[PDB]
Amino acid sequence: DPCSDENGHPRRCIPDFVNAAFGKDVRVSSTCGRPPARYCVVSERGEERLRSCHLCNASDPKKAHPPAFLTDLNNPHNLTCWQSENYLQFPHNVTLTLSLGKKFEVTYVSLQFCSPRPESMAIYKSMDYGRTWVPFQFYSTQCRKMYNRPHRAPITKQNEQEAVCTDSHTDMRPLSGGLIAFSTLDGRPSAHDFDNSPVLQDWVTATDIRVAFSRLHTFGDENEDDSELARDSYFYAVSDLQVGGRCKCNGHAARCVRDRDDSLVCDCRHNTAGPECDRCKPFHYDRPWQRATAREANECVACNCNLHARRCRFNMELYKLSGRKSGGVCLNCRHNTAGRHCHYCKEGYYRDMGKPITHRKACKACDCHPVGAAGKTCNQTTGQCPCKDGVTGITCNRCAKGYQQSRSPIAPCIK
Template identity: 35%
Template structure:
């Protein structure tokens, strides 16, 4: 029983290593999602706790429920006719907002503003103004005629009366920037609070009021089994409510400066739900960075200034380790040292241990000296000075203990005294004592104890006075980083960087698995491209071979697939990489005429082995 457990542990470790390697040697970012999912939305006219006994049939939470599980739900404003309302999302940390998409059940507002706060609601700034007439409503130019204007008339028409969209892109109409981690990009992307002010409602034109669809636009063409909305019950608000919203999508991710691939809870979001796809706000940092947003270097990695990763080149710009020779756990960056070294090294080690001192903990502190037989990074590299208390000069203060040269260990001897520890008289001296040793008064030399002159043939004594050593020069080795090339597409789009998606792949073990499939369509296809439509995604494929078709006609050629998990997960799960050949199997939506890709769909990269299994399944009549 122990061997299988060990094998499972080994496989799990390998899988973890594969996952963690996405940040190794390159910039990385967490998956994107709906920042509003699992969080509380507040409005001006929402029910208070004192009104909790009253049923609110269309609360704000219905704007962020699953559009496929609950296609016919919406939020209805409680504002008086012609009045104002607002929708507010308060986040527990700083996040990056890429775009906002709202789908209205009522006509879109005649005047509306989108605002953000970057200091948790203390101050606000306008992201975009929406008005049918920008000049008369806000006194601003219209971006339809003047590029870059803060106001737009693109999403303020009274029609459609149902299903109208309002779209905002943080990086403008282009929706991209060379480096999404640059200060310029982050100044456009970051926020802590989002506020949508609904200033003036629109009324549906009378000629259209009786012909509007009573089906949720979120359901049409997205789910194989979507029920029609039932007639309005007495508890439902009138269709003439000032503002009604089917869905609010605030697409974004946690702010990690290109140094993390996933995030955890900050521990402050008390209103989050465990079973909802919440975009968490505390980064799990890599590249030797630290902090909730990887905004600083780890404690022992401050040898160079912190930098965000480069989203254009993919360069991770990791923090560099300080050289403290294993004697410190922390260091800090010094601009003065950085300049003095020609901008090569600026780290200063903090709280050197093992009796070491210095910017790099490279010297022994007073009272200690280098051990000649131990390397500099050894915890025993510095050993205490031992000086003969009779023959050595005492330290200036009693707290310092014996003093010796920090390299050689040579003590400071009294006159006429020699030896590393000042333990005996030098040649030509005698009378070792508190005052040192006295010179011999002899033609040659004398006895070192009595001072009696010695015969010229007498055997003299020789003493070796040690000479100080030298700390070896320190050579810094920095790993060579290969040049990385990164596409200039927006780094937070899972359509282009499917490695950010965490999807469980279905495995085919044999022909029997193919025979058990109950999907509407089965085909071999090449993925041509993927397109982010804001509220949904479309994947273009070229059908190579039709193996099974349902009620919808299917033939060779170009066809569109609609991955449903894009809205709820921010990924085209299962992953569909442009340029790859796949065996595809999934459901169809006859009403909309669309082929769907769901979490239960079969998406397997095409190989020769798979081709053999498919041929065998066809021979057995399974396909």
């Protein structure tokens, strides 16, 4: 357990870097096999190009190529590729979208193709679950023409989040096994200083990863009798999609875990709560929430209601009046107690001592003498009602030394 030290006391903890994509369902714009249809594998040996053909059949697992194969275990000698439908050229965009439902720090994105690589393609992140998409990186042989970015634009302080376009890793050539691989901090000026770079802190943060294949390579011949089979030779196919990174829990977790809803969330510690660990757990609002830092754990603490209140709320006034120690304010405070911490008795009650402060019957009712005492409200401690002139006793039901009873209820002791 890295979230507390050798002794009991909490410390900042960060979860492990991983292939965030592994085993995850990737959403795809296209998959061959529904209905089933022919595809062709093209190979070259020098002067010649050879061609084998096969059926993509979704309904038959031995001939299917579903998205699950993008994030399965990659054994290099039993490769499994997702395969798009044949010839979705332009402007047809085919997309692999990985929604983590949770903020991650992305460190790389890797693709391994079983087809030739895309001529043009783009990696995107979302920071707001589905809604908006921003570009991480482009890859194309026509950057200005295709993505309206300039070729190999130099990354600079001025804008360190620049989605570069590049003709690198665009060659039709490795006809399979082509490898494209974006790294988020590769190039970025402040990467060495990353942990003090707010610009880059943002840059790596993302909830989703979209991969858009926008145009695909064709051969320089494409024979005329080959019309159907040449068309059937062009598709996108990927054997392995990775997204390196870690969960963003705010120093309050060492694990991310799927939950009640089977949705990914921090295994949240230090009495914190929420998916990012960005707020406090119920009944733990004595001090306000913070990211755990290098020096300090900032475990938000359990507010005290002396076993009288079920809920509690934070208040800054109270917090500030103590030396920033406690600010919890207990609510609907039960059993005829009241206050911040339910530590004293409701007006018109008093503490039955001996019975300790925490006990359900720690406040007995006041019960003043209805003509002897002036008022209903006792002393919280000692229960002494406020007696009229020449009356004493805790209930104020006897005249004092010096005093006799009167015939009037108003002034019932007189001398």
